[PDB]
């Protein structure tokens, strides 16, 4: 199954996953292409934040679905 | 460009964009709240000329939406455009602002619009907008068109930049740099990146190459790539070229892009809206239909719908149904949206206006400069969640009463308005966001009730010249005054009933005494506008201990975020980690730089070490011991001393006048930029090889080369002048500005020789020589300590740093950097602009109402946005997490256990009490970072027979202390199960 | 002898010492020289709680698993109250130029530990005048992959789940203090086995031997740190004969290359310095009272 991860600043990342995979493994797959540690990344789907310990089937993620990667900022 | 005022903005826009911003005229129509916000943001941005236009007159209803009018203006019935002209021009004296009042109608001659370059329309009937849009887009060149409106809690934005628009920078992110490892003479060729470090590229992008050995034909060319693997990609045919030897650097190339727009009349039948909430992707079309139906109704009846009149709602619903089937996509009709739009058609919500104004100002900047990717083509923001949780309120609660809060009352109702006026709110920091939050509070009437209500704002900093660009509450004649007092005085003018208490403290663990737990208990909501993560974490920990809501926000450039924390519902700030700055590896920084940042960091560290640490050590050492003869005697007796060699060496090489300072600077130049290269080459020759045969001086390492001194080069002269001035300042040697001339330096250096390139007894001899020369007086054992000051243009710090960095870069043959980039990198200045701060402040003000109303968990939202794409993401806040330990016992981060003790309570009694009350027994008690009972370490076995009062050593003001505990795991060899913090009371 | 040395020293590997005392105002006064004073004073935040649990778990391992033998040993001291202050003493292995030395380190655990590796600094630099090893800069910085966070390799970083302080100590002792420190520098291992490499290694070894004889035995005996006074006194008392034999052998070996021309002057200078140091070391050892 094919999914897309669109981060802010327009960069698009292509991922291969299968249902039954676990959110933590899905996010660890991101590191192989970005170097971002799993504990440092938040990913959002359909207005909900994907919690750890769940699987894709629970959130009903299907083929060609889009997930966003977001970060907090420090300036003020 | 006077950098002292636009220092922050240049890092975002750029020199070319700022050049294009000047020589630009903008026409702005409709001086409502939204128009005023747009005008304020544009004037702060720095447009050359702005023309504001309006035809109505001030009314009492306008006081609740405009933060520049006054009672006198309403009494005198002045024109709205004229009454605000004077105050707006005060924001920036470099901007020429003019007012106009020519009537707009169907027969107005639109020929005069060709003078301007962008038109922003607000509070205009739809047919006039259609006509103006038709006229503007047909000019040669076309005139940009932007429309914006706010009705109650619903907003609409529209853009049109002509048939074809050109963008010079799609994303605004700086290109990255990659190192080539291998190339193949194949069709197509295959390029393999270095080990690790994925290229992070995508198909279709363009690259250029340089510094390649063997494949010299590829140097300076441009290729289009096709990603194959995370560590490799492909380029064009290379079979006809020489074999690849080694080396190579590829850097991404930016490419202009062309986008297409459509006229307003055509877009009304199938808009290309932008999705902001992916839970309801179909909402924007329904909102568009509802707004169009409202416009048709207003045209038909020449009035807006009255609140509570059901026939108006039925008519509006029928109009919406008629319109919807005519649309190309044929969507459904949302009854709830139409109902609420009818209910609050005559209201006005200030924070939504602020957010829309910020977005519109960013769009105007995009239109005039072409810097970023423009919006295409609609945007529909709304705050329905505020009223969705009210249920079915009565119509009487929304009727106007005849004061300045009529608009807000018509928006949200009387009860929520009254609950707003009794808030006690604590605001941390008074930066760019703080002023906007204060303005929004003043407009909302927060804390204006006589009986209850207060606003507390704390900030220790003072007003600076560069701060006036973003913070509009400050004025040029306010420099070097506390921020909090000025902000309070400015805010009191907007609303006379506001009660603000201002402080000058900095929220930190040292000042915890004044901000005790009773103070936090008194407050109702805490808002932060900080700029560092340590303060954010400390404030979050403090709020977590008293169950108080927290609202947090931050911006950097064109990106921003907001977060909401509510007790018993959501996780705290500390539940997520933040990315720290990556450290440069020590060898790369010290000996093998490969980019300009490494040289800049080296120069900064050299400045710190040479002018701060060493003088401090010298002063401390010579204040530890009274006399130099005493030190000499102690040395002669074999007594060891700490840092004696360094301080005695500094004493021996102490200059005495200006000429010796110049000579010292020359020697420092030689030592820094000549001998290091020779030593490094001597240790590692250019042809040395590793085990596998690869040359040692391969990428990313760059071989160095010595630099010969020459006074004609400006760089050498600048370095010499700055170093001489700094050394003279440190050693307290008087000097005059005439001595800094090139001729004087040439005369001084004409008799100075340069040594060629190749302990206790020496130190004793040098100290004795200093003793016999009467050089050890009290005045000689003193050196001034300097501090880094990046905002001063005459101390010479930045000049020295830039000169050193550029010299070291040329030593390693790297491209130099100018003064401003060096200043930004050295000072770690965060780029900022007014639009993003206004937007995030509006969103935070929106969320504050939901926090006040006590809405359920599903109402709160978090926003992550990047206006450069543009892209906005609304998500639900993180739900609380259950954590268990044993026996089915579970706890959340908001839990806290309590144990009541007495005067003779012992540690064993504490353990037994916890075990009996909660069912499990602790195995380690630690107070903060100071341990109290750990069985492993020696001597703690006997601590079980001690009084807790002695064992804690508390302060009499506090009646309780907080402790952390841990519990033994079920299976040995595993980490102890964490537990909730436990609060211990000394007595009943 | 080795059994007696092991038996005596096993009771001193782990203990606690009083380093920081607090007054009524909460100010901190250090009774011993500490390299990270400023960070301790500035970082007063008590938000960290997982650090306490991690250190409490580690103290279980540190009380029994520290290496201990006649060749090399490790000693650790920690504050009576705080948990983020430690001092480490490591004795140089045998058959190396660092033989029978006493090297002292300073360790500080940051607030966000174990998310970040602890900071380690060398203190036996002889006033920053000596570079003891390619990985031990003369300013005191110890450079290792496990203590750094950079691109590198995923298995060559401080991994919060698996990496531990004991690994840091063992890595330092096993990888930094080796038989031939000259070849730790990459780029030199190509010339291994060549006469030029052998000559350079001999010069480096002579310099390191004289440096350690000066700043690792004599100075430690004369001005021991208060934390490790008893350990040092009992360590040098029990191994005086071996130290004398080793010093005599080192003096004998260096002079074998005094007749060379390329490195003869350096070897002669090193031999003179070593003789001067040994002359005073003999008197210092002879006057050492029995513990
Ligand atoms: O104190 P630091 O900032 O670490 O700089 C020192 C210092 O150079 P300066 O005092 O000229 O800045 C050393 O000189 P001394 O004061 O100790 O005599 C010098 O040592 P050398 O004179 O022996 O070269 C050493 O350079 P190195 O470590 O290469 O020996 C160099 O360090 P950096 O310039 O790399 O900081
Ligand atoms: P931005 O940098 O524009 O504004 C931030 C302002 O907040 C103040 N500030 C920073 N850190 C603190 C703490 N801990 N307490 C109170 N105020 C703080 C800065 O001085 C800026 O004025």
XYZ file of C-alpha atoms and ligand atoms in Angstrom, chain B residues 590 602 605-606 609-610 614 646 649-650 653 668 671-672 676, chain C residues 138-139, ligand 1:
53
model
C 38.904 23.294 15.178
C 35.376 29.619 15.231
C 34.647 31.261 20.095
C 37.990 32.988 19.554
C 38.108 33.148 24.731
C 40.380 36.095 23.974
C 41.097 35.061 30.039
C 48.712 31.037 31.706
C 52.415 34.303 30.403
C 49.701 36.944 30.043
C 53.287 39.795 27.244
C 48.110 37.522 16.300
C 49.900 33.253 14.170
C 46.235 32.753 13.279
C 48.411 27.100 11.380
C 45.349 19.491 25.899
C 42.460 21.763 26.904
O 43.348 29.721 24.199
P 42.637 29.271 22.925
O 41.515 30.207 22.480
O 42.209 27.801 22.989
O 43.722 29.395 21.675
C 44.939 28.729 21.764
C 46.083 29.682 22.106
O 46.228 30.666 21.115
P 45.960 32.291 21.381
O 46.309 32.590 22.832
O 46.946 32.908 20.378
O 44.508 32.595 21.028
C 47.384 28.884 22.238
O 48.448 29.733 22.531
P 48.876 29.979 24.117
O 48.117 31.203 24.626
O 48.487 28.708 24.878
O 50.387 30.182 23.992
C 47.709 28.087 20.971
O 48.843 27.304 21.195
P 50.237 27.476 20.300
O 50.754 28.897 20.530
O 51.135 26.402 20.917
O 49.904 27.216 18.830
C 46.521 27.192 20.571
O 46.788 26.581 19.353
P 47.177 24.964 19.258
O 46.127 24.203 20.069
O 47.116 24.702 17.754
O 48.578 24.797 19.849
C 45.218 28.001 20.450
O 44.153 27.153 20.152
P 43.033 27.527 18.979
O 43.572 28.723 18.192
O 42.837 26.309 18.083
O 41.811 27.846 19.840
